[PDB]
């Protein structure tokens, strides 16, 4: 089984197992979230935990991934889960984009949306807007398709510059494979548009900034279980 856009495409239509209750996100006992809003935020933490668990089962079944060192596998998911979750939110929220008032709706999951006014209430309006403009809106203008989307996901995960990797080169080969796949696809689906390869990859730095900003908010509200995350990833892959 080869790492290809074809195989990544058939990996999207597969469902994570319900019995992986891991609390990457949780309202802490130390948290500064007001009493009245503990319930909604706790609910959202639970929704995020479901998705994280889905990304773990996804990552584990990427061609050649399970053949990597176990400690490296843990490091790649640990370094990428937050970016992957925001990327997926941005893909889902393209549907809810309709002078030219700023987008109001962020798709957290099928059926469920987060309204801007609530991000404003929670003091995360700036970042809500950046997800929706630099990611969702941009991916709509660029017309990124599902093939392009799953390619970028794999490239996000397969990061050889992650600190503490054992067989760094074994990740580099997997990522280089993805550059080839992505470039091949772009010259075929869109041979007219010079610059598509670069244009797709310019989303990744934007996603890194947004991801780093969201961690600052998460740690301020004591929503992230930093010490336990590595253990959960090991448990889940096992």
């Amino acid at each position: 089984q080869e790492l290809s856009i074809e195989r990544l495409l058939e990996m999207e239509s597969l469902v994570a197992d319900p019995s992986e209750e891991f609390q990457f996100l949780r309202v802490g006992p130390d948290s500064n979230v007001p009493p009245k809003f503990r319930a909604p935020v706790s609910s959202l933490c639970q929704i995020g935990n479901k998705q994280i668990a889905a990304l773990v089962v996804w990552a584990r079944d990427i061609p050649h991934f399970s053949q990597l060192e176990m400690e490296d596998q843990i490091l790649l998911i640990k370094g990428s889960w937050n970016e992957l979750l925001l990327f997926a939110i941005a893909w889902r929220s393209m549907e809810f984009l309709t002078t030219t008032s700023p987008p109001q709706l962020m798709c957290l999951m099928p059926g469920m949306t987060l309204h801007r006014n609530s991000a404003l209430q929670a003091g995360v309006g700036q970042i809500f807007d950046r997800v929706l403009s630099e990611l969702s809106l941009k991916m709509r203008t660029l017309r990124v398709d599902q093939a392009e989307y799953v390619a970028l996901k794999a490239i996000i995960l397969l990061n050889p510059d992650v600190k503490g990797l054992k067989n760094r080169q074994e990740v580099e080969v997997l990522r280089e494979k993805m550059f080839l796949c992505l470039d091949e696809y772009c010259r075929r689906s869109r041979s007219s548009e010079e610059g598509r390869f670069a244009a797709l990859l310019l989303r990744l730095p934007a996603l890194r900034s947004i991801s780093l900003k969201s961690f600052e908010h998460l740690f301020f509200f004591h929503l992230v279980a930093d010490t336990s995350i590595a253990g959960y990833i090991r448990d889940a892959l096992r």
């Binding site: 280089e176 992505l182 670069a198 990859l201 730095p205 934007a206 890194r208």
Partner: protein, 233 residues
């Protein structure tokens, strides 16, 4: 096999000239500063000089004078810490695992410790190792620096102009790579790895922000030039 147009070559040559002309502070600037919290003061004072050099490279870039005064500050404040990361990568010595300053003294993990900047040096040196593992040339480096400067940033009044300007530099870089490797498939890998740097310098730039905020909170003597450009509220 797509050749470089006269304008792309004129662009490449210009950037290579401005690059080496601005990679080190002037003789007099450097003598004025070294005319002497030792690690801390030389780190902060050299960082002022580095940022001044980045600004002068930026202004010499074609496309920049076409951008409004307000967007120039937006671009420069956002990008200057990221470009600074490329500049240390070029001065990294693998064998001693250290950064070579413009005065030719090697600064280690230890010197940054004593200067209270242990937070920043780990990920910086790792970046340097990964960055000197690539073996990048002067043209990749020059083009990449222009690509970082003309990146999309929050608060831009004309982000489509900036995008159009950056698109020309990305193309020049892509076409320059094709001409180095006779247009084989691996040109996409080389081009992808280079673009991958854009994402790792966003982490380092934000770490630079946090370091500045930390230093201010810990009542350390951080220059106003740097506090200003990096919005150390």
């Amino acid at each position: 096999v797509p050749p470089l147009t006269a304008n792309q070559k004129s662009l490449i040559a210009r950037l290579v000239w401005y690059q080496e002309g601005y990679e080190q502070p002037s003789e007099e600037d450097l003598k004025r500063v070294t005319q002497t919290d030792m690690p801390f003061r030389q780190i902060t004072e050299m960082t002022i000089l580095t940022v001044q050099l980045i600004v002068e490279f930026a202004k010499g870039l074609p496309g920049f004078a076409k951008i409004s005064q307000s967007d120039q500050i937006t671009l420069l404040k956002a990008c200057s810490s990221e470009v600074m990361m490329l500049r240390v990568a070029r001065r990294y010595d693998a064998a001693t695992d250290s950064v070579l300053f413009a005065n030719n003294q090697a600064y280690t993990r230890d010197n940054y410790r004593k200067a209270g900047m242990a937070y920043v040096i780990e990920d910086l040196l790792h970046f340097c190792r990964c960055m000197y593992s690539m073996m990048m040339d002067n043209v990749h480096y020059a083009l990449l620096t222009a690509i970082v400067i003309f990146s999309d940033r929050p608060g831009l009044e004309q982000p489509l102009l900036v995008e159009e300007i950056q698109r020309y530099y990305l193309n020049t870089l892509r076409v320059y790579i094709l001409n180095q490797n006779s247009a084989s498939p691996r040109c996409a890998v080389i081009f992808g790895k280079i673009l991958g740097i854009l994402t790792e310098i966003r982490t380092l730039g934000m770490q630079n922000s946090n370091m500045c905020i930390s230093l201010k909170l810990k009542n350390r003597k951080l220059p106003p030039f740097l506090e200003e450009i990096w919005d150390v509220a």
